[model samples]
Target: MDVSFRLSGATSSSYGVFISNLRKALPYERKLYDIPLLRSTLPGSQRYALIHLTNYADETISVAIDVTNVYVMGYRAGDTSYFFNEASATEAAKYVFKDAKRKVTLPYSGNYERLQIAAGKIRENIPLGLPALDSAITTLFYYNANSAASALMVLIQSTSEAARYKFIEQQIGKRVDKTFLPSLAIISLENSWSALSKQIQIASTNNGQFETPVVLINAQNQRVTITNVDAGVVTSNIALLPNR
Candidate 1:
């Protein structure tokens, strides 16, 4: 299933190139879930990831991720002594997962159940920050939709390698399951339980919902949307919610 979100004038059709590039970054895409053991443990774990701007809707949107992992499991799989399993070098650099063509359903739980209560009232929005932003070029991402049910990727070609690496290391990081912060946070329209349920399911199945925390960061606005996360209280070391 190929879904895209981008700027108005930006073309969504070329998504094939984006998909192809992601295939190289995340080779063994189809076989990802076939990893053997992860099936039962991670059931809905992602097989790929991607990036794009939602040209049609609001300019920015985002949601918070539970930072519990950062504090507790910060240690990577392949640390010196532990030597746990970790992603290879190449896999770490471009970690986007995607599913071919399948439609999944959302569960009737949490605020998701509100989908049945109302229509069109559901909308989520969030913030993403980019320094020395670029207006002409837009970023792209491709991803797997299982673990976290979402992943965020920022793509830009004309920027300085220095800053790009810094941002990647600081903002994105090397782990696929890792969670990062977008400059802002919010939810999609006030979805009733039923509509919200479908939205979440659509997110999981088609648009990649199984993978949470897929933040859409845009350079033009130097902002982004924190998608995927559904629950939990959030706070950060970066800045306060209301701002100073």
Candidate 2:
């Protein structure tokens, strides 16, 4: 039996380059799966084949097969440790898109069930640090879906990379809400979850969420601050910090 394969991801020129590389390896599915660098452990005796390529910008590529029921595999270029099963792969993709600056156009869109599943996978397995931030920002540059924009904002402000903050302002500033402050503390350093949470809470309470702008250094030694202008919207200000 012939298996069905599908590919989907970022539409940007950079993304096209990435997709091209992936496409090059498609013909040798079995060999690639067997090989470590291109390893993917999809089971069943039937041969796998490409069914479709959704060349849209969404920060991920998925593989779907219709066999006993429906099986899908999602993979991100940055994370090559393992071939994610349908749930983890799909969720991981959506998590990255949370920081996207624009709406991701997908010929084949994923469902909420899969999106939630992807989020859970991130919360569980993915470490909350530079890798997460890089994945989020990189995906944001491509897909930029507005729905999960805050996830990116929170990440941008929380990081030591001062340069990325501009992306937050330029990309998702309009959509950012009071929730940004709390969300910033959600993903803490590997060992300092509670400490970070308290710090963020104190800062929010003292500075007043989105009410009064204040500057403070996070546990990671990054200057974290936001400004509530006399105007209606609150703008973040991290004065004179150089780009990453």
Candidate 3:
């Protein structure tokens, strides 16, 4: 049965208790894990994030909410419906489950030529649960492959996650274009590489990856990380690009 609850709804209290029950239930299970850096959890297909902020008062308010994935749940930076709350976050996590929607990862045993082909395909739509990356590289590349031409090219390393890219989306020059007009594209990385996993990755990030989450301006170039994620640092990096 679909497990949804109403101890009222999105504004619930006992997140600590719910998380306890949540842990006990899914101990040896495969596809479920916690992404603590973002204070988020992925129970099967759901993306539950715990956000803490000081509302008008000084009390640190914590919120448990659902957002599909960082890449393509939808372009919802301004949508409030995504923040459904803690009780609901745990309640929604209940329906005793099975091995769920996870990206199937495999070892890269192919030659560099085939690796190149695989990398090209994986770059568009990467899967969730991308395993702790074993591969890494730093290069100059466009944010979106489809809208292929623009000013920004990312000259950064490969050790960032969807959460990192999400912030980058909000941080990028949004109204950027050839003539500096309004635009939108995408951000992402890949962790799985079997033929099957490749197709799945394509499905999640976008058949083209930049199609959903629609953060405007995939200028063919741009990059950053920490202070790298900082806006002025982002500005500094973009200014470093060839202004031809």
Candidate 4:
């Protein structure tokens, strides 16, 4: 609900049929997927990704598109950008790498510990059915928590979906920002501990009977230096778990 520019209409939701039901949950639920990986299909809510090379035209290529448990949503070299809905890169993948100058774009609702996309470039595109990705025929976008997303128009249909949005409207202006990321904050008191730390690791394996806990939660907000733990067999107590 806060688009600086680029506007057309209905995103047609369902993020292209939830990326074709997440590529048919990987060969009929054998479950083995990747595409910026990390999709927990509901439950505790965890899913993140973005790839809209919808349509292309060869130049040099490497392909593999098939996902579910997910695997291959690359990014990790300055993250790359130029399509957060655009301020530049209006169309043609925004000049499709001119000087490209290492792109970047992601803000549909921040919270990305890591994003993947090792590299790019290779045309002959038209994807929005992002699941069968064994030979890279891209198209499938996901990101949800608050606002949610996944419909870059689901790769539009007929009439070239308005000429693929007029090639993203000539890719207006063009500006990028992303590189495996690291630079985002907004923390202000919560509970009592506020040295500016963000830690959440819980693990316990008692042999008394049944007790196993393995947690990892340090979404980074740095400012923690709380040191003081030593008392026999792992005896350091400081608890607070109420985010359910």
Best by TM-score: 3
Best by lDDT: 2
Query: Which stretches of model 2 miss by more than 4 angstroms?
Result: 1-49, 52-62, 76-82, 85-114, 117-244
The C-alpha TM-scores of every prediction are: 0.19, 0.19, 0.21, 0.20
Quality of model 4 by C-alpha lDDT: 0.23
Candidate RMSDs in order: 19.3, 19.8, 19.3, 18.4
- Assess the local accuracy of residue 101 in candidate 2 as a C-alpha lDDT between 0 and 100: 43
What local lDDT score does residue 171 receive in model 4, on the 0 to 100 scale?
18
Q: Give me the runs in candidate 3 sitting further than 4 Å from their true place.
A: 1-49, 66-200, 203-216, 219-244
- Over 1-244, each residue of candidate 2 has an lDDT whose tens digit, in order, gives 2221112322223323332333333322222112111223334333232222222233333232222112232222232311233354344344332333432233222333344343443332333322333345445334444323332332323222121122222222222221222223222321232232233334434543333344544435565653422211112321111111
Return the TM-score for candidate 3, rounded to 2 decimals: 0.21
Residue 243 lDDT (model 4): 15
| Model 2 error, position 23 (Å) | 21
- Please report the TM-score between candidate 2 and the true structure: 0.19
Candidate 3, RMSD to the unseen true structure: 19.3
Per candidate, the number of residue pairs that clash is 73, 7, 12, 58
Question: Is 2 or 4 the stronger prediction by lDDT?
Answer: 2
- Candidate 1 residues lying further than 4 Å off, grouped into runs, are 1-4, 16-52, 56-58, 62-116, 120-244
